[PDB]
Design an enzyme around this catalytic site. Structure first.
Site, PDB file in Angstrom:
ATOM      1  N   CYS A 152       0.834  -1.198   0.000  1.00  0.00           N
ATOM      2  CA  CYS A 152       0.000   0.000   0.000  1.00  0.00           C
ATOM      3  C   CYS A 152       0.869   1.248   0.000  1.00  0.00           C
ATOM      4  O   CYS A 152       1.620   1.493   0.946  1.00  0.00           O
ATOM      5  CB  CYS A 152      -0.950   0.024   1.201  1.00  0.00           C
ATOM      6  SG  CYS A 152      -1.804   1.621   1.361  1.00  0.00           S
ATOM      7  N   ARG A 191       0.191   4.640   2.891  1.00  0.00           N
ATOM      8  CA  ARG A 191       0.279   4.493   4.344  1.00  0.00           C
ATOM      9  C   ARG A 191       0.723   5.740   5.086  1.00  0.00           C
ATOM     10  O   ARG A 191       0.681   5.724   6.327  1.00  0.00           O
ATOM     11  CB  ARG A 191       1.208   3.341   4.689  1.00  0.00           C
ATOM     12  CG  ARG A 191       0.606   2.001   4.353  1.00  0.00           C
ATOM     13  CD  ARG A 191       1.613   0.918   4.558  1.00  0.00           C
ATOM     14  NE  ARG A 191       2.548   0.843   3.439  1.00  0.00           N
ATOM     15  CZ  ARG A 191       3.715   0.231   3.514  1.00  0.00           C
ATOM     16  NH1 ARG A 191       4.072  -0.330   4.662  1.00  0.00           N
ATOM     17  NH2 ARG A 191       4.524   0.186   2.456  1.00  0.00           N
ATOM     18  N   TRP A 225      -9.126   6.459  -0.505  1.00  0.00           N
ATOM     19  CA  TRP A 225      -9.458   7.181  -1.729  1.00  0.00           C
ATOM     20  C   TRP A 225      -8.537   6.691  -2.831  1.00  0.00           C
ATOM     21  O   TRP A 225      -7.528   6.026  -2.580  1.00  0.00           O
ATOM     22  CB  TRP A 225      -9.373   8.711  -1.576  1.00  0.00           C
ATOM     23  CG  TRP A 225      -8.105   9.214  -0.977  1.00  0.00           C
ATOM     24  CD1 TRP A 225      -6.885   9.397  -1.620  1.00  0.00           C
ATOM     25  CD2 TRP A 225      -7.907   9.611   0.380  1.00  0.00           C
ATOM     26  NE1 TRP A 225      -5.960   9.880  -0.722  1.00  0.00           N
ATOM     27  CE2 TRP A 225      -6.560  10.012   0.509  1.00  0.00           C
ATOM     28  CE3 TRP A 225      -8.739   9.651   1.511  1.00  0.00           C
ATOM     29  CZ2 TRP A 225      -6.031  10.457   1.722  1.00  0.00           C
ATOM     30  CZ3 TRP A 225      -8.212  10.094   2.709  1.00  0.00           C
ATOM     31  CH2 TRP A 225      -6.872  10.493   2.807  1.00  0.00           C
ATOM     32  N   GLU A 237      -5.186   3.706 -10.636  1.00  0.00           N
ATOM     33  CA  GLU A 237      -5.986   2.507 -10.407  1.00  0.00           C
ATOM     34  C   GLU A 237      -7.158   2.453 -11.370  1.00  0.00           C
ATOM     35  O   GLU A 237      -7.450   1.400 -11.950  1.00  0.00           O
ATOM     36  CB  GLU A 237      -6.484   2.473  -8.970  1.00  0.00           C
ATOM     37  CG  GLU A 237      -5.409   2.449  -7.911  1.00  0.00           C
ATOM     38  CD  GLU A 237      -6.025   2.435  -6.505  1.00  0.00           C
ATOM     39  OE1 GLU A 237      -6.540   1.371  -6.094  1.00  0.00           O
ATOM     40  OE2 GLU A 237      -6.001   3.489  -5.829  1.00  0.00           O
TER      41      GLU A 237
END
Ligand code: HEM
Ligand code: HEM
Ligand SMILES: C[C@H](O)[C@H](O)[C@H]1CNc2nc(N)[nH]c(=O)c2N1
Ligand SMILES: C[C@H](O)[C@H](O)[C@H]1CNc2nc(N)[nH]c(=O)c2N1
Ligand SMILES: Cc1cc(N)nc(C#CCN2CC(F)(F)C2)c1
Ligand SMILES: Cc1cc(N)nc(C#CCN2CC(F)(F)C2)c1
Ligand SMILES: [Zn+2]
Lengths: 415, 415
Positions: free
Chosen positions: A113, A116, A285, A290
């Site tokens: 991720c 973070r 969000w 993506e």
């Protein structure tokens, strides 16, 4: 033993000692690196009572050596209190403060991720008193409303009862709370999202009447205490969508694209001090790529590169005309421009990857490291013009953690 | 034990058994993955006589079980012949056919090279009779002329005498046979290639008179049998360069860009049956993104994104305008277009990555695997619209191999 990671664009070096605390295994060995395997056995998730106390003790020791109350009476009595309750029950229950800590640190420890830097600003919704699939729907609706915040997206997670025996399991069958349906045509092609063609069939199998269009928001399939799952439709006023337009090309509106604002993953497993939470929807969000690269341009997803290249008027005969690349950049400018003009929170891959480097700095100072998976951190376009491309990263598995788990319909004993 | 790798765009699965034959170590452990470390200790390169025969035996067994003459008399007598010569000399010498095999399989085993579909078409130049730095220059000139082939680039490698004691070492001090000089200004900025600022200083230190422009081809610094290295200028008619122009934008010519046609790496080490060849320049042809993304747009290299964005007239205030991405695609269309219009061999990242997937197919059939480093294989732009992004890859170290080695000026005992 105390490893070094280098940045090859700035020459910064950081020293990692946090990997010493690592417990889980990675998949790699001294003679083989599996850093590009998507779902190794270790990243997927049944436990017994004997193994439970060291995992509890280890976790409790993290939490009390966090609020700087390590080894003291408040720690020792909670140590013995959980000990006694694992003997008594062959399990235990987390305090509300321990749940909030464990969930924030699962996100903090998520090496794939890039978001973070936000890990400590996570809103935790305790749903461990939930008993029915209607209850789940209600909690999930309140999560969607809170996290969306009318476009000022807020990070949140909702946590349903933990696994006990295994045959009683709370599960959200959807892979994300909000996804578009996948319909396969009679000739063979696909309308909507081909990723969800299989899930869409399960919903029609259970009673869903499909509006068989492109961007049809899927119902929720919620399974409570092992019972068979039930369908519920998220009230459409709670599903915020952004119509995609370009800031130069006025034909871009007629493309007819839109996406949803809230990325909310619902099929993973939250592990805290040995306890397993099989249903733990969490949302943040979007990073623009993506949607614009993977969702829109993956060959097995929406796959719009050719239609965008058409309306751009492009040299589509040759591969070396880079028409695919050229149309990809415009699609991502439009994704960003649309979310921003509608005041729906989004981050571009340059901003997000800079923040992650800044997050790594902080993590090596006040923590001694930051497990990071280069294969997932580097964005799926323009990789080397973002700073993460040039940053070496050590990957290792810490707990608390988010893990993958098998789909419920391969394991559920129906009736 | 017999691992599976999946392609997540086509659903193809391949089974890898070749990793069983792996000998070297990777850097990763069961608890840590270092797949994003650029130069782990294992990928860098002194050996003794005892260790030499198993490595010879292992290599000889590969070569004879290659020309389907395994275990026979021709194999066994060569086994004993090398055995005796390692006793006699504490080293040995490869047959010309064994050298050509070992070098082709070093390239074949290079897990970071996306070009290996070509591994068997490699021209091998035996320079083990070379004694002087003038001799080296002459061999290197013949390599450049052959490999360039007036733009119809041909793959080749030239192999100088193997290391013996260690203090007598043939070395090409340049990192590539053809590179542009790096000059640091009195204010602080840099003309030419900032990567070579340090090497450029060593050449001026040794007598090179710098034309102090941008694209100044560097002299060669050649070190023979451990002696101090000497400067030689490659005859400019042997250095093929391509002026970079765009097929739409006529301001693109005035940008004043050019690159060289021949990528020829000269600082690595070729390892064959335990023998170490410290100077082994090898060349192929470029994939476009090496020039257009890394060479031209890396922050610590030529760094032209802003000037290209300027002349494109771009929204350069915001990061989310994706002006960096948009200008990057045009630079790479121009790189491809220029090389092709000049009939200088080049491959785009879509063609190259398709060929590598096709190469992986063949390698899992007739070989049982293909060691591959996803971090290096995936191109530095538009990653996920190329098929390698979605292909899982197992990385492991086979021999014969190309390895890194320390720079000569950190180790050379001068005089
Ligand atoms: C706050 C804004 C956030 C941003 C910008 C962000 C960014 C991202 C992105 C781009 C991915 C890759 C997704 C993909 O490629 O499919 C990812 C993966 C992930 N994120 Fe974050 N995320 C955010 C919030 C969160 C939150 C709130 C959590 C958990 C509570 C979380 C946990 C994860 C996990 C567990 C993964 C992938 C794990 C795996 O595949 O093993 N993220 N994130
Ligand atoms: C025939 C055309 C070839 C193409 C298109 C090609 C392509 C590439 C590319 C794009 C890279 C990455 C370079 C970088 O990112 O800096 C690479 C790396 C490499 N190539 Fe190939 N290459 C070719 C020929 C060769 C030959 C002839 C050899 C050896 C004889 C070779 C061995 C290697 C090695 C050893 C590396 C990097 C190894 C490392 O960093 O550990 N290549 N190749
Ligand atoms: C094969 C490879 O591991 C797979 O395609 C990965 C690569 N990196 C990724 N990175 C992110 N962020 N998301 C992904 O889905 C993937 N897919
Ligand atoms: C940190 C990281 O390993 C480093 O930047 C790597 C990433 N992948 C790469 N891939 C290629 N082909 N070439 C490179 O120089 C690099 N650099
Ligand atoms: C919280 C969150 C934020 C974000 N920006 N993105 C995602 C995502 C996603 C979907 N992918 C498949 C997965 F691996 F589960 C993650 C999730
Ligand atoms: C033979 C060859 C072909 C190609 N297409 N490219 C290269 C290259 C390069 C420079 N990089 C630094 C390195 F790691 F040594 C490789 C080499
Ligand atoms: Zn690894």
């Amino acid at each position: 033993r105390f490893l070094k990671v280098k940045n090859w664009e700035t020459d910064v070096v950081l020293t990692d000692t946090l990997h010493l605390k690592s417990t889980l295994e990675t998949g790699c060995t001294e003679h083989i690196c599996m850093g590009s395997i998507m779902l190794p056995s270790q990243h997927t998730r049944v436990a017994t009572k004997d193994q439970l106390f060291p995992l509890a003790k280890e976790f409790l020791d993290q939490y009390y050596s966090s609020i700087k109350r390590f080894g003291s009476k408040a720690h020792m009595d909670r140590l013995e209190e959980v000990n006694k309750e694992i003997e008594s029950t062959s399990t235990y229950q987390l305090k509300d403060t321990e749940l909030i800590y464990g969930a924030k640190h699962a996100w903090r420890n998520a090496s794939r991720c890039v978001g973070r830097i936000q890990w400590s600003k996570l809103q935790v919704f305790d749903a461990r008193d939930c008993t029915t699939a209607h209850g789940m729907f209600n909690y999930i609706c309140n999560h969607v409303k809170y996290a969306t915040n009318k476009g000022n997206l807020r990070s949140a997670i909702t946590i349903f009862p933990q696994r006990t025996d295994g045959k009683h399991d709370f599960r959200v069958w959807n892979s994300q709370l909000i996804r578009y349906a996948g319909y396969k045509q009679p000739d063979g092609s696909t309308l909507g999202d081909p990723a969800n063609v299989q899930f869409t069939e399960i919903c029609i199998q259970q009673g869903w009447k499909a509006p068989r269009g492109r961007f049809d928001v899927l119902p929720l399939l919620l399974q409570a205490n092992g019972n068979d799952p039930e369908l519920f439709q998220i009230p459409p006023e709670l599903v915020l969508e952004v119509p995609i337009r370009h800031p130069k090309f006025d034909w871009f509106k007629d493309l007819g694209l839109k996406w949803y604002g809230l990325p909310a993953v619902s099929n993973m497993l939250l592990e805290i001090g040995g306890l397993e939470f099989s249903a733990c929807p969490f949302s943040g969000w979007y990073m623009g790529t993506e949607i614009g690269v993977r969702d829109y341009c993956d060959n097995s997803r929406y796959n719009i590169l050719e239609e965008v290249a058409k309306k751009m008027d492009l040299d589509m005969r040759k591969t070396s005309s880079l028409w695919k690349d050229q149309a990809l950049v415009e699609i991502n400018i439009a994704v960003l421009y649309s979310f921003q003009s509608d005041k729906v929170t989004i981050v571009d891959h340059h901003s997000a990857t800079e923040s992650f480097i800044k997050h790594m700095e902080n993590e090596y100072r006040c923590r001694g490291g930051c497990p990071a998976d280069w294969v997932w951190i580097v964005p799926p376009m323009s990789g080397s013009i973002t700073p993460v491309f040039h940053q070496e990263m050590l990957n290792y598995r810490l707990t608390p953690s988010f893990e993958y788990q098998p789909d419920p319909w391969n394991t559920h004993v129906w009736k």
